[PDB]
From Swiss-Prot, chains A, B, C:
Keywords: ATP-binding, Chaperone, Cytoplasm, Isomerase, Nucleotide-binding. Together with its co-chaperonin GroES, plays an essential role in assisting protein folding. The GroEL-GroES system forms a nano-cage that allows encapsulation of the non-native substrate proteins and provides a physical environment optimized to promote and accelerate protein folding. SUPFAM superfamilies: GroEL apical domain-like, GroEL equatorial domain-like, GroEL-intermediate domain like. It catalyses: ATP + H2O + a folded polypeptide = ADP + phosphate + an unfolded polypeptide. The lineage of its organism: Bacteria, Pseudomonadati, Pseudomonadota, Gammaproteobacteria, Enterobacterales. PANTHER family: 60 KDA HEAT SHOCK PROTEIN, MITOCHONDRIAL. This is Chaperonin GroEL.
Length: 525, 525, 525, 115
């Protein structure tokens, strides 16, 4: 197709106009006095939300250049939420602030590459200052507190999360399910988790979390690339008769095979999801057998001469639940015999003794930790179904917050950590004046979150920002109560991972956009 | 269809506006401080790239005359990348410079043909100066250094390439594959490479390299022209069942047969690729049998009275991997018996003794070299899959660079070699004044790459260009560190083949466009 | 008023468009087969003319930038006719040729200043070649021949001019008047000529010659600047009563005095003309008194305390005729007594004896030569009034041609001298390549007159131009008879002064116009 | 002082370390210093040479060494006879900076309506 090509300043304003629509739409929801955004759906009454992520996904613009601007920031800002479970809105507001001031500097005739180098240097410095400011979260008391604060001052949730992490450890796998009554439950079962997400976003059946949940699914384990649907017809038909959903773990599922499975699930003739097998090379083959023993299936390797057409139900493994998101796949309560699993574990602990390399023993130690460790399952209870679903959501949300808090600690929330760190970097310089401006752009952008929160509350951003800079440490402005004090004590905090991730991702896309000289897109019509 | 016909200056300025859009889009990415180009994809977030080739592929213009101008330069500039693995962007920038100053001269009333002949004379001279400036790359130490510089200062890559070239020789065949762990591997297997590319660009399944990669494919050996799919059906259905891809090597595939195999591969009902059989006449028939023995298939020759309908999947040979690009086809790890291959080799060596002509001996000697020589296979290892894929890419890229360096040597990079060579040709003259201008057009165009690189850095092109002309040899301006010195020593270099190819191709299309008086295209509606 | 301001190329193409309208209108008339131009006047039937000067005067354009272009070339091209009595059309066609090729070079990116210096060098060289090519015109035989050729092959005119030049010398003053019968007359009378023209072009009452002709006028001699008309009223009224024209010779006539006299003459209440007194300083005062003695008037000097209000009719001198053009004033047949004039002459010759300086003696000798020498008066006779006026015109025109021929000689006409001189300057070079182009622009422009003449004849310019370059000396193409030969022998010649003046004036403006970067004019409003 | 616009570029080169009370003033300084090259560059541009290259070489030297634009050679500008009265160069700069300063600090303009 014939393309529309824009250059230089003409192109960069277009992108800025686009990011502004995204940012301005999402940033109204920021802080304790955040505003509602109304999202239209033409099947019923419109949605009213204060979720910046929900707003962001809806944003698509007519002007194709403006749209490209919005989609770039969306893409990168969403990676903040993937990592830490929060800070897409923050990342978007930061991105807007860095780009705006960055482009002002470019128009003033400063070198884009130096501006980027200055921004990046300010960020690297700021991240270390966040490390320094961070309060650790180690003991189970602290864990319960962070879980409580994350779950809207609900102490039951803090206790649940603390008890769960006490059983399977800090780096254990924890799941949340629907409860079967009033009482909460906690059980550890045979399970596993590997870092491979869905191969298509159209598999998502729980759009709120952005995840694929399969109840009592069969699991296909193939040691090959599936490109055609021809070879999976006898297996798909055998799964349809049993009327159970199917997970496919293969080397890759692409081309016609992927497309057919995407459409079938959306029509709803068979519910299916596909993920890549974990790892690569020889280690992949080994981990594909680990899940085989766990689920009680057999790997269909074409290497020793097995075909997918001669795969029956008995070859597929099964679990009680599978949960897939953009990055991770969790397998919950496999039907593997304790004999087979404990044998596989003993077999790997044999190989650790015979291992020559340190790299080999740490990789084998990962695999044993998965099989031996299992998975914790929290079943959230409540009086009604409505309360149960609501609490579950808060538990999942607080779980991700607490996990992040354990990794990197907590810092003052309400956009205070960023403004604190920025105030400590006044004397930071670069190689030239252009880089110095790049630094000052970044430092000034780190105030954007606080100011927006304060603006939503109806207070003067400049005055509050001014007072917060006056203090030191985790002293800041509680936007909810309109009082100053220790932010951690007052219970207004963010995981350090959230604030860090939000800043680095924001600076990533901002840096790229500032150093863009050309854009290519399809023609208006 | 009724045509739109433009003439003379009116036509030439349309072309120039087209080449400008292409060149201006691609040339922003040039140099170490090269800018980003954003390429839109209406299925997700847009691509951000500094790859001039990626940008060039996208460029298509609405105005049919402007488009023709862009497509002509794209076509020719891409041939530079095909030959040397670099310098499409350089060729485009050169072309723009030659055409711009060429059309100035045509408007000043100078004969286009003389301008062309002057340009061509300056280029032939410049290529000879590049040979003189070139530092050879012969010993294994040097091969490692060039491989290291090409792979972003990674000594492990230089070492890999050097070891691979030590195994099979400088004229040897070298492949790169995915690794199976942390360790790198180097193995020589039964294989062959011949100079025949894909018969349709629509067969490309790895668009990054611009190549078709078939894993464990069947290979069809036909000694005829396949124009219809009717005769292909019994064979296509027998490979669709085995669920493996298919390479066809015939005298030619065209017409109905080609079109059907294009659309089938795109839809993904069967993955298929097609290439012509190597050579022509009697020697083609012989080389088809060489591939048959290697791959363990049987040639389906209609001359002895075999039909393609009666072909079975026993007749097809198979290999572990096939890699085809625009010019070459590589068959990797054939399943041929060593008894059969060594027998074929002995049979060829017999013919060398019976050969009367020198030409016959040389042709038979390059057949034995293919069978006996085999193919090197570098499996690139890393810790993570992401790191492995990334390193593999750098190895493939460095391999191409090093191959080119071995052929013709290396010269100062950063656009210095061209400006150096141009400075040595101040006294070059032609048959008349018009040719003299043609020379000065070319010499002045050879500065375009350096100036653009310096412009992207934010420095004054004129001043840098001025200083670089002052010195001699491979003294130039390192654009990354902003210091002058020996460019080869500082590690900023290009294969002489790249710079040569870029200039010659650039001057080719420029010369044709300058001497265009008429353009014919379909009318807008 | 607010101004329209144009720059660079935009301004220079406007000027060229304007020069084209002028040149194209005038150049059709060039040569023996020159075309008619029809000039509209809204008081009768339109004029049909082949006089390029008549055409030029009419040309004024609506676009103010185009107009400026035309007016610049007109202004200087007219100076050629002022000097030599021919070659305004030639100067215009040359200017067009130099500007056209000059602006092509400027757009090709060559330095305007160098182009000008190259043009100027080519012209200085060409003028030297014209002097070498020039055939002298000294002896009385040659005078008659040139006069005959100039007067349309009329031998009576040639004799008349020769006899006149024999009487008063080669540097003598010669007038032409209407005859009183059939016979011609030649008389030498008391008169003078000085190099001061009309102070306003609106005094012109003979528009064909572009001259002021007053019959039996009074002459006012004032040794002051006249700015106000109030001091002129008693003198103007006295002149209006006598019903005779008035010539005013003052230090200067400017401001309100000039304006009032311009309007009064155009109304026709008093016919009056004004010129500056000749020379400056002490030399001026002396020469005013020379004119006073000649005309029998009194100098009104405010130095000795005379006022212009107390000036009566007796104070004004008178002559039988005064003829004023753009450069010269001629006083013909003054009413000064022979006693007073011879007395003034004797008085000056006395001062020559007392003179110490050689410069002083030469200046005094000039003044004596004017008074003692007088003025020749040719009365042209014919059978009818119509024939008389017609012949009188040819005599005036041939007189100017012959005067010019005496000064600098004759060269081949028909545009041959220019093309000959250009052919001898092929190896002329400058300080750089830009100057070299400037030279070639000029040399190529020198062909424009010939080619235009040949084009008007309906022959091929390139062929004729080619043949003429083949020969040497004053060999050329007689456009009238379509035969080659010695142009002087065939009687097709131009005064060397004409060709020289035409070229120098053409190159003058062409140079200035090429080196113009900005134009300022009033708004279209 | 040295003419051809080299006196202004010379003194601008000596004032690289000049700073003010804040960053905004520092930019104001660099604006002025960079503006002092405008005359030379324009002279060189009119000659058809590269302003950047000539400006560069002139900064390299010291004193009244500069580029004679007429003869296209470098040397002592006073010796070569290309000079300006110090009063001219001074006056031109001060008056230029006067009106520039006023215009930069203009926030409102009042004039009669177009019609
Ligand atoms: Mg969250
Ligand atoms: Mg390459
Ligand atoms: Mg005349």
């Amino acid at each position: 197709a014939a393309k529309d090509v824009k250059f230089g300043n003409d192109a960069r304003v277009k992108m800025l106009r686009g990011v502004n629509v995204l940012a301005d739409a999402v940033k109204v929801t920021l802080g304790p006095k955040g505003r509602n955004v109304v999202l239209d759906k033409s099947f019923g009454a419109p949605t009213i939300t204060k979720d910046g992520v929900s707003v962001a996904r809806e944003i698509e613009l007519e002007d194709k250049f403006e749209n490209m601007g919005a989609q770039m920031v969306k893409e990168v800002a969403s990676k903040a939420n993937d990592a830490a479970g929060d800070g897409t809105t923050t990342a978007t507001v930061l991105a807007q602030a860095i780009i705006t001031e960055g482009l002002k500097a470019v128009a003033a005739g400063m070198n884009p590459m130096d501006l980027k180098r200055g921004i990046d240097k300010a960020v690297t410095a700021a991240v270390e200052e966040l490390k320094a400011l961070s309060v650790p979260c180690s003991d189970s008391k602290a864990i319960a507190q962070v879980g409580t604060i994350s779950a809207n001052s609900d102490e039951t949730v803090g206790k649940l999360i603390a008890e769960a992490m006490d059983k399977v450890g800090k780096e254990g796998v924890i799941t949340v399910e629907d409860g079967t009554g009033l009482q909460d439950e906690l059980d550890v079962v045979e399970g596993m988790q590997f870092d491979r997400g869905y191969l298509s976003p159209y598999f998502i059946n729980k759009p709120e979390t952005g995840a694929v949940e399969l109840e009592s699914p069969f699991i296909l384990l193939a040691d090959k690339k599936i490109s055609n649907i021809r070879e999976m017809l006898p297996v798909l038909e055998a799964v349809a008769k049993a009327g159970k959903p199917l997970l496919i773990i293969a080397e890759d599922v692409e081309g016609e095979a992927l497309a057919t499975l995407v459409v079938n699930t959306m029509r709803g003739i068979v519910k299916v999801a596909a993920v890549k097998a974990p790892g690569f090379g020889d280690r992949r083959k080994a981990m594909l057998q680990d899940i085989a023993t766990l689920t009680g299936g057999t790997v269909i390797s074409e290497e020793i001469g097995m075909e997918l057409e001669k795969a029956t139900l008995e070859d597929l493994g099964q679990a009680k639940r599978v949960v897939i998101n953009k990055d991770t796949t969790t397998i919950i309560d496999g039907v593997g015999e304790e004999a087979a699993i404990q044998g596989r574990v003993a077999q790997i602990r044999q190989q650790i003794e015979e291992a020559t390399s340190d790299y080999d023993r740490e990789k084998l130690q990962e695999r044993v930790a998965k099989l031996a460790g299992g998975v914790a399952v929290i079943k959230v209870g409540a009086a009604t179904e409505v309360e149960m679903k609501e609490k579950k959501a808060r538990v999942e949300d607080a779980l991700h917050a607490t996990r992040a808090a354990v990794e990197e600690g907590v810092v003052a929330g309400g956009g205070v950590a960023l403004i604190r760190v920025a105030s400590k970097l006044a004397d930071l310089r670069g190689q030239n004046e252009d880089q110095n401006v790049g630094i000052k752009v970044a430092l000034r952008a780190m105030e954007a979150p606080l100011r927006q929160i304060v603006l939503n509350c109806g207070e003067e951003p400049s005055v509050v920002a001014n007072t917060v800079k006056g203090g030191d440490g985790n002293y800041g402005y509680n936007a909810a109560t309109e009082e100053y004090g220790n932010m951690i004590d007052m219970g207004i905090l963010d995981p350090t991972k959230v604030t860090r991730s939000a800043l680095q991702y924001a600076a990533s896309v901002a840096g790229l956009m500032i150093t863009t000289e050309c854009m290519v897109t399809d023609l208006p019509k």
